């Protein structure tokens, strides 16, 4: 599969192939780096209104290399979100909980930013008013797969200084067979 390269929201992205198909020691060492980043993921759960309390039932910044934006994107708190995003250190990943972080999410009104997609890049989205903790966990597995298939610069001195994000197959196309092949459901008149 093919990747997008980001190199030094308004920047340009181009869709190229991975540089590992062009050395054999670099291939396994990059695999070990991606494995280490995938297995040990430290989250920074941002404290917002009513998705943050939902994932409570499921640390300080700059040691957590991952931000989970939970609640509604208020215009007063959006600079706080971006500032806390630039606090964290590369590599960093973003998981959006709820419709309010993906989009405006039932609030298309003056005081709500239409998602954090307007100002920070998001790696994984989760749809819907408050998602279950199992949905957050499955998003963690999906992002672990995305991190495990990546090509980041191993050092800032020697090597290609560009980040390669993989074009994953979308979950609606992958799970299309098991979703369309659903015949019957339980009636809502029982428990």
């Amino acid at each position: 599969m093919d990747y997008t390269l980001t190199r030094i929201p308004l920047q340009k992205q181009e869709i190229v192939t991975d540089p590992l198909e062009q050395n054999v020691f670099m291939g396994k060492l990059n695999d070990m780096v991606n494995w280490g980043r995938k297995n040990s993921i430290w989250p920074y759960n941002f404290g917002l209104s009513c998705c943050y309390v939902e994932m409570v039932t499921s640390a300080s910044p700059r040691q957590a290399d991952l931000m989970v934006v939970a609640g509604t994107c208020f215009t007063k708190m959006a600079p706080v979100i971006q500032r806390l995003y630039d606090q964290m250190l590369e590599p960093k990943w973003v998981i959006s909980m709820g419709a309010c972080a993906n989009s405006g999410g039932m609030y298309d009104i003056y005081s709500v930013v239409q998602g954090v997609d307007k100002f920070i890049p998001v790696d994984v989205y989760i749809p819907g008013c408050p998602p279950r903790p199992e949905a957050y966990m499955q998003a963690l597995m999906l992002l672990q797969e995305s991190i495990g298939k990546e090509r980041r610069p191993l050092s800032w001195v020697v090597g290609d200084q560009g980040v390669y994000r993989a074009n994953m197959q979308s979950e609606r196309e992958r799970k299309r067979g098991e979703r369309i092949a659903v015949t019957n459901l339980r009636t809502p008149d029982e428990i």
């Binding site: 917002l48 007063k76 039932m106 609030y107 003056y110 008149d189 428990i191």
Partner: protein, 571 residues
């Protein structure tokens, strides 16, 4: 006579007292469906009318609400003064167990009202919110600024000409705000915040998340203005946008821990507007779900207050809520007919399993809360106020009954068949201490368990939707196999239920205090005005009145002891 009838309330003795004091003229009595006497007072008589109400033999001691309204687009105004804008003050007398409303008319050219903070000190945040959302200025008001929106905001959001849409997101404005946040402590001017200008150190101290500025004499704290509006969702302005039926999730999302409790007052006020008298089964279902979510909120509050000095209970309540309704947190299940669906064929088993296992959990909770001498010592004597700082600063939650004031909405103004359920409310004695508030909420949790047991015992087997033609939506099977029901479902889903132009008000004992909805209809399918009075607004306004002379640790212990929610505060 039905309880939803449009009454004028001239038989109220307060109207006779006003006629004896200020003459039969100079104020206009309006006949609404709010259930309270509404009088239009002229602007220059407002201060002396409020002073007269404050010096009655049983005076109106609490300012329940204070907010504006844009009368420019209101077509159905009969028996009303010529007003471009209006400001309504809702006042509660507990000794009379009554309440009055005071409406002041305003023109476009002079949107100036005399201030009300010299009479009721909780009017500060209400007048700031009126100046923020409307264009109404208050004369003689300290630090009159925007409280929900930042100071670099041009228009007034709740005005009718203001578009209720998210504009294009420019990163340049967000970079201005980021640079302002970087230099907020450097260019801090303590004159816009209403502060006294060498020990005094100014810092921004970042349930919800909100900033609270603090003035330090060393560690001891002398002044504080809690900066709110960071969780402003525009629930009222969206109430002017959504129909009567589509606004139910927005009523769920103001207070997420309450949920169904918070969609209760909107539904009851909408039924008052439509003239719908729901059957007794609907009332019992409403009572059961409201006490279920109240148990959720009280358990979470007790667990949060006890953690710093719970999982299975809330999960079992959420499983029961998922069985009765859709997903667990925001049910969106109360309709204008009263509920979305009927109860399933297994709720007896789940409710009985929940009710046969929680009393020993209550015994464990009381054994824990009675024996923690460290928590009792840390929570004793902190933020002490008896009935006077709680009768004037709003404070309608468990603190009001912790002062000894016997005023519960479920008993004083019963709703949804709460008179049929036997429960003795708890009241504290004297000081409204934090530990007394927590014990009061423990006893409220026990009473809610008793109410749930009563609901499980005697559930009527009537209809789950009323027979009124304005029940939105109509019953689903009749919609699917009858054509008139299809007509009503079509026109109540597509355009919205057409409700006559009246004014309704529902006052509800919420999970944390008294939540009220005030709905003004212009005869259309939307709401011309939606006002949501919240307890946590007045609970957050009283921190400067209580924690002047305490430390930061005492301040945050009091903040944890307050059951406030930031999204509940900022709507």
């Amino acid at each position: 006579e039905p309880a939803w009838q449009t009454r004028d309330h001239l038989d109220d003795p307060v109207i006779g007292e006003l006629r004896n004091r200020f003459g039969p003229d100079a104020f206009t009595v309006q006949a609404t469906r709010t259930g309270v006497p509404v009088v239009w007072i002229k602007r220059e008589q407002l201060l002396e009318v409020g002073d007269f109400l404050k010096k009655l033999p049983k005076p109106y001691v609490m300012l329940f609400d204070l907010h504006g309204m844009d009368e420019r687009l209101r077509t159905h105004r009969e028996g009303l003064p010529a007003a471009d804008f209006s400001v309504f003050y809702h006042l509660i007398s507990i000794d009379r167990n009554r309440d009055i409303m005071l409406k002041v008319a305003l023109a476009e050219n002079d949107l100036h009202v005399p201030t009300f903070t010299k009479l009721f000190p909780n009017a500060n945040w209400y007048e700031r919110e009126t100046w923020d959302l409307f264009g109404i200025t208050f004369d003689g008001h300290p630090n009159l600024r925007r409280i929900m929106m930042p100071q670099t905001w041009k228009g007034h959001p709740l005005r009718k000409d203001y578009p209720a849409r998210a504009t294009e997101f420019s990163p340049f404005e967000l970079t201005k705000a980021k640079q302002d946040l970087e230099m907020e402590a450097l260019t801090f001017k303590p004159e816009e915040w209403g502060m006294k200008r060498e020990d005094f150190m100014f810092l921004n101290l970042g349930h919800g998340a909100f900033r609270i500025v603090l003035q330090l004499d060393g560690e001891e704290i002398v002044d504080c203005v809690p900066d709110i509006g960071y969780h402003h969702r525009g629930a009222e302005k969206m109430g002017e946008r959504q129909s009567w039926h589509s606004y139910i999730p927005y009523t769920d999302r103001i207070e997420y821990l309450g949920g169904c409790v918070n969609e209760m007052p909107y539904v009851l006020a909408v039924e008052k507007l439509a003239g719908i008298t729901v059957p007794d089964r609907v009332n019992v279902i409403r009572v059961m779900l409201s006490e279920l979510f109240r148990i959720n909120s009280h358990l979470l509050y007790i667990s949060t207050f006890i953690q710093d000095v719970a999982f299975t209970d809330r999960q079992k309540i959420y499983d029961l809520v998922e069985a009765i309704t859709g997903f667990r947190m925001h049910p969106a299940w109360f309709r204008i007919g009263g509920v979305a669906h009927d109860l399933p064929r297994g709720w007896d088993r789940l409710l009985r399993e929940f009710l046969d296992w929680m009393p020993k959990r209550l015994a464990s909770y009381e054994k824990a809360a009675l024996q923690n001498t460290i928590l009792k010592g840390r929570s004793q004597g902190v933020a002490a106020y008896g009935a006077k700082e709680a009768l004037e600063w709003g404070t309608t939650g468990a603190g009001l009954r912790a002062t000894g004031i016997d005023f519960d909405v479920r008993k004083a103004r019963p709703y949804s068949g709460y008179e049929n359920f036997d429960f003795e409310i708890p009241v504290g004695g004297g000081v409204s201490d934090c530990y007394t508030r927590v014990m009061l909420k423990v006893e409220e949790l026990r009473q809610s368990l008793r109410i749930l047991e009563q609901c499980l015992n005697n559930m009527p087997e009537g209809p789950f939707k009323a027979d009124h033609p304005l029940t939105t939506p109509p019953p689903k099977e009749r919609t699917l196999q009858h054509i008139e029901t299809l007509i009503t479902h079509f026109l109540q889903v597509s355009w919205g239920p057409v409700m006559p132009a009246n004014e309704s008000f529902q006052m509800i004992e919420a999970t944390k205090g008294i939540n009220s909805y005030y709905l003004t209809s212009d005869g259309s399918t939307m709401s011309y005005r939606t006002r949501i009075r919240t307890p946590s607004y007045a609970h957050l306004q009283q921190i400067p009145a209580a924690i002047r002379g305490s430390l930061v640790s005492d301040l945050i212990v009091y903040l944890g002891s307050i059951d406030f929610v930031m999204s509940d505060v900022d709507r």
